[PDB]
Design a protein around this ligand. Sequence first.
Ligand SMILES: CC/C(=C(/CC)c1ccc(O)cc1)c1ccc(O)cc1
Ligand SMILES: CC/C(=C(/CC)c1ccc(O)cc1)c1ccc(O)cc1
Ligand SMILES: [Cl-]
Lengths: 245, 237, 11, 11
Amino acid sequence: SLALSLTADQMVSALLDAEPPILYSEYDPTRPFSEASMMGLLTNLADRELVHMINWAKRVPGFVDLTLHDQVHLLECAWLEILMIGLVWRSMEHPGKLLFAPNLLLDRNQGKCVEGMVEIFDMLLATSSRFRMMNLQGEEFVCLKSIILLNSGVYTFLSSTLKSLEEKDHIHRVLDKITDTLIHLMAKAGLTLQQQHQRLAQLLLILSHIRHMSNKGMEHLYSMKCKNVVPLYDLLLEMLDAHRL
Amino acid sequence: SLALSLTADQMVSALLDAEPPILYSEYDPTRPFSEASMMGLLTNLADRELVHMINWAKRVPGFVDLTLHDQVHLLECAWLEILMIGLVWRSMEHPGKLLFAPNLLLDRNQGKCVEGMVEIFDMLLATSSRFRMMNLQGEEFVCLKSIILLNSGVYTFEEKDHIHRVLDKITDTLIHLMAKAGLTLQQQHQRLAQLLLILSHIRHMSNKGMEHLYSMKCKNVVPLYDLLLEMLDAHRL
Amino acid sequence: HKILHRLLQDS
Amino acid sequence: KHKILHRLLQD
Ligand SMILES: CC/C(=C(/CC)c1ccc(O)cc1)c1ccc(O)cc1
Ligand SMILES: CC/C(=C(/CC)c1ccc(O)cc1)c1ccc(O)cc1
Ligand SMILES: [Cl-]
C-alpha cells in the first residue's frame, strides 16, 4: 500500500474519502455564554474532534509507514493547526463568523466572552476572509491539511543515522507528491504556469499564518488551564502538554 | 507601485544590494558564558541588528510604498523571524553551530547556559541543517527573507492587494532563479514548496523565541535595550 | 503521550 | 505614540 505510487487523482481521492465528519456542539446551549461556558463548549468539541483527527491521520498516505513515536510527534505538534484550518475552512461561506459547528456559529463579538480570545478569533476570521478571496477549493484544502500534518513537526524530529533519516526522506517524498497533486489540480483548472506557481505559494504562505494562530492558541489554552477554566478532557490536555516538553 | 514592474533579475539585484551587514558581538574571550552574559550578548546583538533591519526593509521593493503604519505593523510582526532566518543563513557554513556573529559562534551545549534556550537552539540548528541539505542559495535566501517581511503580518493588518502583488512578484523571481539554475518544471514547484514550508517552521521558532524572551525579561537576568523592548512589546503587553 | 499512543495503536 | 521604530523608519 505504497503512497509514492499514488497518482495525483488517486491522492485527492484518498484524502477526500478520509475527511472527518463535521461535529456538533452541545445543543441549545445557555446564552449568553460565560467564560467557563464558552471554554467548555469549545474544548469539548475539540476533544471529540481530536478522536476523529487521529483516525483521519492514519488515512493520510504514508502516515502509517512512519513509526508510532513519529506518528505521535507529528500529531502532537500539528493538532491545533489542523483543528484551525478545518475551522477556517468551514467558516469560508460565512463572512464575519466562525463555524465551530453547524449549531455553533460565532462572530468576533462572542469571542470577547473569553479573555484574550477575541484576538485569536480575529486572526481566524482574517484567514477565512483570505480563503474566500482566493476561492480555496476542497481538493486544495485537503491537500493543505495533509501538508500540515507531515510538515509541522518534520524537523522537530531528532536525527539518528539513516534510521531517523529514513523516517524523514519518506515524509519529504510524500510532501513532494502532495505538491505535484496541488499543481495538478491547478493545471486542470486551466491556470497558466505563472498562475500555478503564484497560487501554490499563496496557499503555502497561509500555513505560516496557521502555524502562528496555533502557537497563540496553544499559549492561550495553557493560560486558561492554569486559570482553571478548562474542563478535564484528558486527550485534549495530554496533547496540550506535548507542547511543554 | 514601482516594484511591480521590476524584472526578476532586477528584483534579485535590489534584494542582494539591500542586504544588512554582518555585525560583531562584544569582544571577550571569556568562556564559558554565564546566563546573564549570554543573554546580554544575544540581546545586545539583536538590538543593534534591528537598526540595520529597518534600513534593509526600506530597500525591499514595495515596502516604502506602504504607509508608515503598515510598515510598522509588518516589522513588528516579523522582526524575530527575520533575525532568525538570517542567523540560520549564516550558520549554514558551520554545521552544528549557530553563527550569531563571526566572533560569537555557539553550539547547542552553550545554549544550555540559559534556561530554556537549548530548545530554541535545537530548532535553529535543525533549520540550518535543512537549508544546507537543500543547498539554499543566497539569491533564494534574500527572496525568502523579503517574503517573511511582507507576509507574516499581512492578514493581522488596498494595501493588502499591493503586498499580495509584490508577494507574487517574489514568487515569480524564485521560480525564475530555479529555472535559470536548470531545474525541471516539476523540480521548480517542488523546491518552491519545500522552501515556503520552512517559513512555517521559522514562524514557529519566532513564537517560541518571543515567549522565551518575554519570560527572560520577567526573570530580569539582564536589562533589555529600548528598541528590542519596543519590538517585543508589540507581541505582548 | 498515553491516550494518543493507544488510540493510534488501536487496530 | 513615540517609537524608536518610527524615527528609524522616517530617517
Ligand atoms: C479557537 C477555539 C479552539 C480551541 C482549541 C481547543 C481553543 C479553545 C480554548 C482556548 O483557550 C484556546 C483555543 C478550537 C476548537 C475547535 C476547533 O475545531 C478549532 C479550534
Ligand atoms: C535566539 C537568540 C536571539 C534572540 C533574539 C533577541 C533571543 C535572545 C534571548 C531570548 O531569551 C530569546 C531570544 C537572536 C539574537 C540575534 C539574532 O540575529 C537572532 C536571534
Ligand atoms: Cl460527536
